[PDB]
Subunit: 277 residues, 3 copies
Amino acid sequence: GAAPAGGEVRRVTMYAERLAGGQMGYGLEKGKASIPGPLIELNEGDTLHVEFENTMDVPVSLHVHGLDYEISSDGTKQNKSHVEPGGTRTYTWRTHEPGRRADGTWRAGSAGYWHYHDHVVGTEHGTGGIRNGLYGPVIVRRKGDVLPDATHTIVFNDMTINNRPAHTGPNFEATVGDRVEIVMITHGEYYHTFHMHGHHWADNRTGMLTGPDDPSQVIDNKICGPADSFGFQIIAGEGVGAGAWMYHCHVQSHSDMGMVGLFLVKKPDGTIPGYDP
Amino acid sequence: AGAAPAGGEVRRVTMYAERLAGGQMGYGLEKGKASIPGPLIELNEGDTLHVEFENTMDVPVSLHVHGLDYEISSDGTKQNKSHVEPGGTRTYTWRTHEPGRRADGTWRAGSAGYWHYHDHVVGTEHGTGGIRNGLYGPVIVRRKGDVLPDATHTIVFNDMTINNRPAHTGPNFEATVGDRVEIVMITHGEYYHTFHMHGHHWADNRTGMLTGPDDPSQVIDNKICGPADSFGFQIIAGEGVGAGAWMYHCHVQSHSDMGMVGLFLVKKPDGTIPGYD
Amino acid sequence: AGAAPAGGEVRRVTMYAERLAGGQMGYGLEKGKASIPGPLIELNEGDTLHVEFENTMDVPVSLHVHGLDYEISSDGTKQNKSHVEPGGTRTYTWRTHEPGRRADGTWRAGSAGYWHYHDHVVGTEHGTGGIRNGLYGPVIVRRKGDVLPDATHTIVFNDMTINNRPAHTGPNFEATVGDRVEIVMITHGEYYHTFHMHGHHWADNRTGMLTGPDDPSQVIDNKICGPADSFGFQIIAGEGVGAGAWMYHCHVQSHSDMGMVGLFLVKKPDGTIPGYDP
Ligand SMILES: [Cu+2]
Ligand SMILES: [Cu+2]
Ligand SMILES: [Cu+2]
Ligand SMILES: [Cu+2]
Ligand SMILES: [Cu+2]
Ligand SMILES: [Cu+2]
Ligand SMILES: [Cu+2]
Ligand SMILES: [Cu+2]
Ligand SMILES: [Cu+2]
Ligand SMILES: [Cu+2]
Ligand SMILES: [Cu+2]
Ligand SMILES: [Cu+2]
Ligand SMILES: [Mg+2]
Ligand SMILES: [Mg+2]
């Protein structure tokens, strides 16, 4: 399928909740917070009212990249758009289509791979909140964008993937030929290089070349730093077949210390040749 | 606003290297008016710039530029004996060119872009001391038809400082909603950074603006950069987000916590900033 | 200058992993001829390459490639048993494809680009020791019509070294004004770097050259890179700047200070270089 035109006013409830071991997460339903937080998907033109509630005992905020928001949804203590413990606030995110300005220039649309995160826990830049897990992905689609069979979010948060213990993935499953979308976000203190065995994408907005006139580099390794986000769609096993296809940071001490996961690509019969964990 | 005209003029300017307060060093176009960053040099593709350089300091200095056309005698390195002894003078010559089709059929790219100049001999034979002290400045080379901004602001991430300013001391930049604001972003020293602007976004290409609906460049509000990287872009102040004190900062978490933050102060037409002191 | 032809040929090469002087390890295409960086492999989109691999060492080694098409049995990892035991042999197969349209209407990029191969097994399950020792090399996949260079030079930022060399020992590369020179730039190890070339510049895209007036890619002379990044470009030696000893270096200041520097020696037609004494 493909993304339609946007322009709908959407509403969602979001909660900030404490998780085990001093972690913190966002969720759309009480008791269902996750790290990373829930995936938010919009079409260019949609407005999103996030009916936010802070269930925790310390102030929290919601700050987003890329989308249109007024200063009252900045989500910063500096602009008093944070949320006291037990408090509620409606954060409003807007998005727009590309189009030609009055001055004749081309205004870019909001479409892209974006993210939201806390901006007040621990420090007035959310350093503690981000460490604890207060981050999630946002995808804004342009009319006509191809929709994937599945979407997986990989966050390099310092020297962890999605705040998980070292050497515990996460792993993602697909069948050869699935259209798999990856959302890749970085957070914290470190630079990383994201690498996928057996797969490759275009270094552009969608991760696929628009066609024979697109000059973007085709890569399988990409340097990223704190708050970078990008994404792409790949065809699982395309040209390479089934297997346990590693993805990892390629900084050698990072992969050695467990910033590694598996893209488990199954044959139609469900099997993965050579996988023996 | 307006549009850059075709280039090809032979320009001259005087430049001085001078000590500034606090052990710093800076370039200036007039004696006693050195600044950090140094003066913005603007050229149209095809222009030549003769820089009549004077070192007013007691140690050797040099002038090295990125991206422009210069002969080995304008390298600005002791390795090529193109540095300037204390109290000495030298004319550095920079040339630029338009794009065009080569005889071998390939396309020769033009000089247009966001570039920079800096010292290459103070402290070490790579200018490590000079760059630390403040000897760096921006160069913009425009292509005919490029959109001209209402103002240009230079943001240099020099090690753990912005423009050699003390931690948490800006700089701040003011604009009015709707202003076409041009940002030149340069990085120097030892560390990688990620430049982020609240409430604004740009295209990751030469100009920071999409050329049109066919341009696949990623639209971003966060960009990793390392020593001697330079990029620039233009934004419409407050476009889709309104007035406010819009933070910009390095997004490496400890760097924003330890002072690499500033404010893009976007005023209403009446000159006020809602929710700002 | 010449142009790459269409691909589609089945190629075969023998590759040896061998210990080198100074506690290093390298790949070579002929026995006793290993080098750091490893030999340059050049393919046209559509070519298949069968690498008949020989491990002459006393530890397991592997061959892992970026960007190219390979089945899991040619992954080159211990995890799926595609490493090569000491004294062993294995045939790794690399395939490449041309650009085209998918049935779902989307464009499938071709394999063309600046890629690289390296060990994935020595020292750790990610080849940390093998890469550090010198088990890396470049792979160029050309698209039909790509312009061919007069020379190709590979520059690998491996931890704090260039091509595993001692600090302040280059390498240097020579050219004549007007030569079309190709640079393959690969990064490995632990650290980020920024690659800078005095006097020259390129486009931040697949080929390093703008396709024409509609290509909006940034033109640069400085680029941040991290472990396993690869890019490449072509420059006309001395174009608009003339002959000379043109430094290239990492621009992280302590890195250039510590010797991550080399010389692009661009000669005049008489063979001399202005302002440079050998
Ligand atoms: Cu912020
Ligand atoms: Cu990493
Ligand atoms: Cu790999
Ligand atoms: Cu952020
Ligand atoms: Cu230099
Ligand atoms: Cu920083
Ligand atoms: Cu932000
Ligand atoms: Cu420089
Ligand atoms: Cu790997
Ligand atoms: Cu370096
Ligand atoms: Cu330079
Ligand atoms: Cu690799
Ligand atoms: Mg691009
Ligand atoms: Mg990039």
